[PDB]
């Protein structure tokens, strides 16, 4: 059934799995029309499909053209996500296909289940985890490739850079979720924390700065403080 704190280590075992987050697939700006009605303008989106063990990110860019002349876009976005995930599984060699796909939002279960009927041995699962994958668009290089896309495109990243050379998947995932949680709670402050020191750069082939193990501890502390500061603001507590 559902993926929670009870079965957390399962993310880092040797059964191939992918998280699918659909929260940046259908993105709009709401604006006033000349007549003073309200209208939406779609912007490029993305499916966030992540192997939490390897860090391999299948960023399917959703070009605004896929919405042209379609109705009920928030509903269509779930089915387009399911179609693209199903197409990605079918494109992988059998030994690379996931044994499980975990959807971050329960509204993806039926659409993905129906698109994956051909794969009855792939378990489609919800999660009780509140994962901050919506903040993926706060990673500058992911945001840049989505906004510049002029057509549908798949781009492959490693969202852990070279971290797995030094740390386990479990620790790499905990670092990623803390970074994304911070970026989601206070983007400006999180990005300030990440770039404040200009001596630590982001390699051309990386998403995050080249922090030493000691600098990661400091960064991770600053991110926790940011999340707590923000939480004390939200709630007056």
């Amino acid at each position: 059934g559902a993926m929670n704190s009870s079965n957390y280590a399962e993310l880092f075992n040797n059964d191939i799995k992918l998280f699918v987050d659909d929260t940046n697939v259908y993105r709009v700006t709401v604006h006033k029309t000349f007549e003073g009605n309200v209208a939406t303008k779609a912007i490029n989106g993305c499916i966030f499909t992540l192997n939490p063990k390897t860090g391999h990110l299948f960023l399917k860019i959703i070009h605004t053209s896929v919405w042209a002349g379609q109705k009920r876009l928030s509903q269509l976005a779930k089915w387009k996500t399911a179609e693209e995930v199903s197409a990605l599984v079918r494109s992988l060699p059998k030994e690379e296909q996931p044994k499980q796909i975990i959807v971050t939002r329960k509204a993806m279960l039926d659409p993905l289940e129906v698109h994956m009927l051909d794969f009855p041995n792939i378990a489609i699962r919800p999660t009780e985890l509140r994962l901050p994958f919506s903040a993926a668009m706060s990673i500058d290089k992911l945001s840049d490739v989505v906004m510049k896309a002029t057509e549908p495109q798949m781009v492959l990243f490693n969202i852990y850079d070279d971290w797995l050379d030094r740390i386990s998947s479990y620790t790499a995932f905990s670092r990623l979720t803390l970074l994304l949680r911070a970026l989601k709670t206070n983007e400006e402050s999180a990005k300030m924390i990440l770039l404040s020191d200009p001596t630590i750069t982001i390699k051309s082939y990386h998403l995050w700065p080249s922090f030493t193990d000691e600098q990661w501890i400091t960064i991770e502390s600053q991110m926790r403080d940011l999340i707590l500061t923000e939480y004390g603001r939200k709630y007056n507590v």
């Binding site: 089915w79 659409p111 289940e113 129906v114 698109h115 009927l117 051909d118």
Partner: protein, 300 residues
């Protein structure tokens, strides 16, 4: 008007005949049911006074042979049997009638209830859902599972209802996933009506049989089948007008006949709410929506 004589009634039992029921006392001189209307299937059903578990019964049609009930003290149930000797049978019935040892099928002349519940139900279709080809009548009970329930265990004693599964390759054409899942018209019209049932009459006959097995035996799998067949129509944007008008009549008589006290176990809240208030056909079942809103507003 045909007769189902009983050899005897050695155990205290509630006897059902279609929508009617009669208590018989242990060794009461009861010798059966007369004046059974020709032209319809019937069901004769039993619930033992000493073990109200296992409701069981027999679907039959008096046009197909001479049927009687005899208690089997080894298997501990009232069994239907065929009498192949016409003259023996006529002579048994004439005796029991002369001695007035038979209950009369108590039909009110105004009352089309049984016709309206069995309009599309045909003994030949029942015998394909309930496989026991050496008998012309069909045994059903509370506990018999459906082919679908057995997939999710004795195949001989199963109810072979048509498997309906909204998340199956049968229901969803490759490349029409969202369209076929949100609008089941393809599944209803091409797969089920044209493909498997051949016509709406056979589809309604199975729907009506599933309801009656759910109501008379509390057969849970029957109830699942009745709901699935309703939901397949209500979830289709494209249904022939005659089918919608006939469905509304069918469901109206089913809801009208359901014991008020069994609504909580026999009616699926999700299916009825979806069918009457959210589905493509939410506005197409006027009679059914009115009786449901007036009889079972709690469920809705």
């Amino acid at each position: 008007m045909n007769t189902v004589p009983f050899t005897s009634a050695p155990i205290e039992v509630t006897i059902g005949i279609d929508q009617y029921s009669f208590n018989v006392k242990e060794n009461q001189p009861f010798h059966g049911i007369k004046d059974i209307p020709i032209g319809h299937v019937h069901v004769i059903h039993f619930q033992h006074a000493d073990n109200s578990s296992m409701r069981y019964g027999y679907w039959f049609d008096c046009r197909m042979g001479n049927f009687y009930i005899q208690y089997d003290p080894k298997d501990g149930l009232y069994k239907m049997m065929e009498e192949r000797d016409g003259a023996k049978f006529e002579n048994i019935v004439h005796n029991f009638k002369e001695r007035q040892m038979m209950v009369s099928y108590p039909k009110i002349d105004e009352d089309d209830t049984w016709y309206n519940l069995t309009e599309f139900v045909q003994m030949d279709k029942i015998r394909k859902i309930v496989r026991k080809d050496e008998n012309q009548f069909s045994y059903v009970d509370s506990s018999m599972t459906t082919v679908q329930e057995n997939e999710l265990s004795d195949p001989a004693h199963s109810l072979n209802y048509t498997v309906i599964n909204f998340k199956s390759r049968e229901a969803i054409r490759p490349g029409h996933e969202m369209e076929d899942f949100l609008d089941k018209s393809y599944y209803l019209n091409t797969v089920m009506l044209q493909g498997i049932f051949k016509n709406s009459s056979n589809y309604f006959g199975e729907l009506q049989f599933a309801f009656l097995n759910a109501m008379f035996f509390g057969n849970y799998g029957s109830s699942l089948q009745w709901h699935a067949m309703i939901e397949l129509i209500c979830s289709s944007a494209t249904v022939p007008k005659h089918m919608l008008d006939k469905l509304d009549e069918i469901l109206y008589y089913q809801i009208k006949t359901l014991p008020e006290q069994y609504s909580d176990i026999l009616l699926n809240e999700r299916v009825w709410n979806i069918c009457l208030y959210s589905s493509f056909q939410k506005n197409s079942l006027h009679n059914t929506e009115k009786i449901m809103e007036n009889k079972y507003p709690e469920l809705l």
